[PDB]
Design a protein around this nucleic acid. Structure first.
Lengths: 23, 7, 507, 510
DNA sequence: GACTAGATCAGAAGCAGTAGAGCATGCATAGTTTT
DNA sequence: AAAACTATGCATGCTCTACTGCTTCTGATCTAGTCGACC
């Protein structure tokens, strides 16, 4: 339930791709 | 080392 | 979860929705239209079989089955398309606002109960099976009915009836000059009133950020590739389901259209003999193969019989230590094996016991796998997979078995012999420093397929007639400048210590 | 690559009779020859096979002289194997009464090799002698035969029906052993095979073999460091090189059958539309938007081909095997004849191994190949070290499916007795043996060493059809099933645990 | 009596995934011709 | 006798077309109940 997609119910809201982030 | 009839 | 998602976009048409607090800002109507268009595009890309609708309340004109007053159903529940997006596009700008005002009208009274009744009637009109039913209310008036108490009671009763029927309600409040406070009226109508969603909000809702975030990846509902039988013996059999957690994404197949009128054309391939020229049925043909300067002829039925070894399913062979499995022996994407009690009762208990004991003893079940009929068998290993959850208790690793294909002797190849040269500790340390400099955290969803994203962008631009397609930023390209800045002088030292003065790697 | 093999046999009467409880040596030699020729025919390695028989009534040799070099015939000259050779061994090869010394057979075999080798690049030569050593030995030219064999670099292999023999057979074996020691020495003793041993090894068709193409590229870390590397495909799903050909049933020719494609419209009139008027398009929701091929190429995603770049380095724990994608595995070594590249690659491999790290990299085969994101990890062995590259998934390729938990399921909670039964079953069905002396695991059922049964079945059926034009196909060979099943010990040990599990677990079909 | 409503089963269509076939691009090597 | 140009076979990747299995829509049948009007 938490963090649910507002466009496609039943699927979790996929986060945006961030590529490589060096530490 | 198989060679001849076996290769 | 079976059915389709039906969504209704209720947009207020009051005066306050067409005023901008600041010169450089978007009016509530513009933001609502942008969100609707973004959701339409996301639905088209991800799930094109879903149902969406667009309705307005507070307009002067009316268009609905019940013939209520001041409610205009612009778009009834139907599959999304480019035509609807283009129609909505004519309200995006200020000129679009004037066009909307001329076509429909605004600044008239309304009753929320009638709007909810119209939404319910629209929901009932659908003939398919609906897994979800949702309504979103775009408004910036926290007290639509303050003068009339009876109207508020009617709206509350209608909202309760809709909730009982199984209709979800969401409030996407927009910026208001005096602030939007949900506590006055919308506590009862809103399906879920979160504990944090009680204070006065001086800015638009955060859900609009999620809505505007375009999703350009196809979403597939859970489905079982096959329902097979695992046979520990000729008498002990259990039912299992096979799923594909990882599947390669392909562009939608191209279609063939007629140039003149732009309508689908259907193809058909037929075989004919040269002399007579008549059609040749499959029963009047054979297969040939040349070996040893001779022709061997087999019928089609025998050719398909050549692949028959055993009936479809998984046949147990034993258990193997997990150390004997080799990572570099990858041959095919792995699958997931889960219990299924529909076909055989009692499979779940045996599967759970097997999983628990395999985890305890660190062993993998070797098996012979035959997915379909007339398919040569393969060798697979079922590795136990425990249930792993993240901080928010959202499952990230499901429990079951991981089916990994093992290679045969034919699947391997021989590599040319090469002499081995070992580097001294200094070079290893320098390369260790270089590697440590470029450390980063990797995850399975940190990259996107540039080809698919570009194809989707081009298709959207062509469909909606955009001036230029949106250029997708490729995250797979190395950040040469950042790596050069971070490494500094390490590369020069490594090149001095590993390469002769005159080496010229490029040439 | 090429190899010329002269198979020397005998048809003396000494093999025509044997103990009735075992097959005759002549039959064993025939079966061995048949299996060898079958493997050569179904393995297109362009090897040449000649057949010579010593101990026959007739005489046909390039060298005749006097009584020497007699009673020997060159049955089949040196040429590619064919089904005609199989028919010839099936019927033409017949027993006989005349005896003959195998030394004369060997000299004639070398004469044939020397005469027919010229004109072709046969980098290897082998002579296989199938004899029982019952005939007496005319040991009078051993020095010259050894000298010629060493000069011409021709290998020798012998086959005997024993691994309780007459003194004549013992003397023959001793002379054979001496000849092998002279040729090679100690290792020669391993080249004396028995008919049963040869039958055991030659019971499976040759596995499909393909040569990987060396793929040169440059491993880049940033914009100033580049290491020349060569990649080869290691693991892939092998297929059949040949494909079935559609031929007419009556004339048995592929020239009289052709394929045609017809395009028409969705209308009652069924109007015909030419290929030139067909355009490409796609479906965008509930409509179809035209997208011509030329425009698609113009707007396609263009990238520089042949790229092998290091996106970054990540801990090995973050990369899991279940996420591996693609249909191949790549082995990356240093550029051939390049010491500096080898040193750089070894340094990188050692650093990654020591730090327990892998490289997330971008891989593109060529300009027309779509870019991929993959993982390269070190592979260090006692003799060779390299990198192993395997593709990794994209965001669009991940599926988020939710499955109910089994550990905390009251309905499906196993009992202690059930767990004990499952443990007993697992212990009984162990496929690995732990040798305590070396404290090492030994594989009872190595799957990687099993040839694919599909190709074996295909070759068997093709051979049966070729030799028997009108006959139903046979069943699957027993040895294929035996090699596709575990050792009998595992099955025997698992009966009681399986019965106990069946008793404890109620299973009812629905 | 006439008529309709809801439950039930099977048949057929749409979609997903796999296997098999075909078509570009390269290049590896050898063969042949020229100097 | 050595070097340069060209031919052909095989490897590789990509795209397109059959065939099997899962899910959902439609039609046909039966069973249960409702409405009309009279006695």
């Amino acid at each position: 339930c938490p963090g649910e997609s507002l466009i496609n119910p039943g699927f979790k809201s996929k986060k945006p791709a961030g590529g490589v982030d060096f530490d | 080392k198989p060679r001849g009839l076996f290769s | 979860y079976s059915g389709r998602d039906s969504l209704i976009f209720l947009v207020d048409a009051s005066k306050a929705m067409f005023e901008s607090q600041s010169e450089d800002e978007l009016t509530p109507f513009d933001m609502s239209i942008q969100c609707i268009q973004s959701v339409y595009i996301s639905k088209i890309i991800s799930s094109d079989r879903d149902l969406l609708a667009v309705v307005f309340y507070g307009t002067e004109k009316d268009k609905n089955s019940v013939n209520f007053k001041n409610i205009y159903v612009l778009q009834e529940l139907d599959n999304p398309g480019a035509k609807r997006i283009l129609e909505l596009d004519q309200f995006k700008g200020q000129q679009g606002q004037k066009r909307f005002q001329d076509m429909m009208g605004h600044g008239s009274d309304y009753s929320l109960s009638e709007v909810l009744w119209v939404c319910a009637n629209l929901f009932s009109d659908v003939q398919f099976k609906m897994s979800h039913k949702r309504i979103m209310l775009f408004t910036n008036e926290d007290n639509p009915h303050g003068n009339d108490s009876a109207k508020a009671s009617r709206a509350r009763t209608k909202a309760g009836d809709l909730r009982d029927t199984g209709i979800f309600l969401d409030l996407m409040h927009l910026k208001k000059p005096g602030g939007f406070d949900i506590s006055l009226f919308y506590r009862d109508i809103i399906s879920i009133a979160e504990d944090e969603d009680l204070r006065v909000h001086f800015e638009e809702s955060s859900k609009l950020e999620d809505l505007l975030r375009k999703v350009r990846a196809k979403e597939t509902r859970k489905r079982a590739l096959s329902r097979l039988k695992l046979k520990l013996n000729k008498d002990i059999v259990i039912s299992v389901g096979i799923y594909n957690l990882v599947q390669k994404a392909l562009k939608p197949p191209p279609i063939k259209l007629y140039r003149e009128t732009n309508e689908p054309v259907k193809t058909k391939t037929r075989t004919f003999n040269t002399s007579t020229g008549g059609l040749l049925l499959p029963s009047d043909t054979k297969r040939s193969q040349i070996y040893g300067s001779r022709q061997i002829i087999l019928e089609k039925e025998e050719t398909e019989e050549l692949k028959r070894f055993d009936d479809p399913g998984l046949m147990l062979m034993g258990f193997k230590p997990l150390v004997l499995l080799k990572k570099h022996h990858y041959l095919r994407p792995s699958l997931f094996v889960y219990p299924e009690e529909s076909l055989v009762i009692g499979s779940s208990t045996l599967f759970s016991a097997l999983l628990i004991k395999c985890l305890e003893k660190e062993v993998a079940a070797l098996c012979r796998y035959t997915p379909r009929r007339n398919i040569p068998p393969y060798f697979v290993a079922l590795v136990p997979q425990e249930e792993e959850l993240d901080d928010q208790k959202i499952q990230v690793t499901p429990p079951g078995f991981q089916l990994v294909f093992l290679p045969f002797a034919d699947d391997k190849r021989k590599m040319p012999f090469t002499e081995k040269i070992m580097a001294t500790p200094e070079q290893v340390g320098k390369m260790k420093a270089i590697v440590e400099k470029l450390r980063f955290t990797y995850r399975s969803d940190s990259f996107e397929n540039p080809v698919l994203q570009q194809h989707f962008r081009n298709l959207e631009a062509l469909a909606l007639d955009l001036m230029e397609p949106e250029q997708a930023v490729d995250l797979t390209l190395p950040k040469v400048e950042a790596m050069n800045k971070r490494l500094g002088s390490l590369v020069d030292e490594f090149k001095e210590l590993v390469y002769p003065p005159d080496y010229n790697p490029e040439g | 690559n090429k190899a010329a093999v002269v198979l020397c046999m005998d048809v003396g009467f000494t093999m025509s009779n044997s103990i009735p409880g075992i097959e005759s040596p002549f039959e064993q030699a025939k079966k061995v020859i048949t299996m060898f020729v079958q493997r050569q025919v179904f393995a297109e390695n362009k090897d040449e096979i000649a057949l010579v028989l010593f101990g026959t009534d007739g005489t046909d040799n390039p060298l005749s002289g006097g009584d020497q070099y007699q009673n020997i015939t060159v049955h089949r000259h040196l040429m590619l194997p064919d089904f005609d050779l199989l028919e010839d061994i099936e019927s033409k090869i017949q027993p006989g009464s005349q005896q003959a010394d195998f030394l004369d057979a060997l000299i004639v075999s070398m004469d044939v090799i020397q005469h027919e080798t010229i004109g072709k690049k046969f980098e290897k030569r082998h002579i296989e002698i199938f004899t029982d050593l019952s005939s007496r030995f005319s040991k009078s030219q051993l020095d010259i035969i050894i000298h010629s064999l060493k000069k011409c670099d021709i290998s020798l292999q012998f086959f005997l029906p024993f691994s309780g023999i007459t003194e004549q057979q013992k003397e023959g074996l001793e002379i054979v052993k001496m000849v092998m020691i002279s040729l090679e020495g100690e290792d020669g003793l391993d080249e004396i095979y028995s008919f049963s041993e040869s039958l055991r090894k030659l019971c499976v068709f040759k596995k499909i073999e393909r040569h990987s193409i060396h793929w040169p590229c440059r491993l880049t870390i940033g914009s100033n460091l580049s290491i020349r590397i060569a990649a080869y495909k290691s693991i892939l799903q092998e297929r059949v090189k040949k494909t079935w050909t559609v031929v007419d049933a009556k004339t048995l020719k592929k020239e009289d059958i052709q394929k045609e494609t017809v395009y028409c419209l969705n209308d009652d009139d069924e109007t015909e539309v030419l290929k030139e008027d067909i355009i490409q398009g796609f479906r965008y929701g509930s409509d179809i938007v035209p997208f011509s091929k030329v425009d698609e190429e113009q707007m396609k995603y263009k990238s520089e081909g042949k790229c092998f770049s290091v996106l970054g380095f990540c801990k090995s724990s973050q990369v899991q095997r279940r996420f591996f994608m693609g249909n191949q595995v790549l082995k990356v070594f240093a550029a051939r004849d390049d010491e500096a590249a080898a040193v750089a690659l070894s340094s990188l491999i050692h650093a990654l191994d020591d730090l327990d790290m892998v490289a997330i990299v971008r891989y593109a085969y060529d300009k027309r190949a779509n870019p991929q994101v993959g993982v390269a990890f070190p592979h260090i062995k006692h003799n060779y070290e390299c990198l192993v590259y395997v593709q990794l998934p994209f965001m669009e390729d991940l599926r988020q499916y939710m499955f109910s938990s089994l550990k905390n399921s009251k309905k499906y909670a196993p009992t202690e007795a059930q767990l004990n039964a499952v443990d007993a079953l697992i212990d009984s069905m162990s496929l690995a043996k732990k040798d305590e002396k070396t404290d090492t695991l030994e594989d009872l059922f190595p799957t990687t060493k099993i040839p694919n049964p599909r190709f074996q079945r295909l070759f068997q059926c093709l051979l049966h059809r070729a030799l028997h034009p009108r006959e139903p196909l046979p069943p699957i060979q027993q040895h294929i099933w035996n090699m596709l099943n575990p050792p009998a010990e595992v099955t025997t040990k698992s009966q009681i645990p399986l019965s106990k599990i069946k008793t404890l677990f109620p299973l009812i079909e629905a």
